[PDB]
Amino acid sequence: TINTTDISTLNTFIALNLSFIQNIDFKAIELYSSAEKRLASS
């Protein structure tokens, strides 16, 4: 009499190794600095 854990167990899983979607934070950007905007007031 022995434990069932000692007996090797085989498994048949075709591993559906997925890959989820990471989350990015969209940094707000701009082209022309406010200093240049003032310099363009002329």
Added chain:
Amino acid sequence: KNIVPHIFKVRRYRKIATSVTVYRGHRESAITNKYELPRPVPLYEISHMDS
């Protein structure tokens, strides 16, 4: 595309002529100021003046 306006320096010359006419009655002050006409400079003498 750059938007900084082009900058540089400049030198300007002017000639101003004005008159004061204040003696109204016996003697007055600031009775009438002249036209105060501003005029350009004669270049050649001005260049000598500039020189």
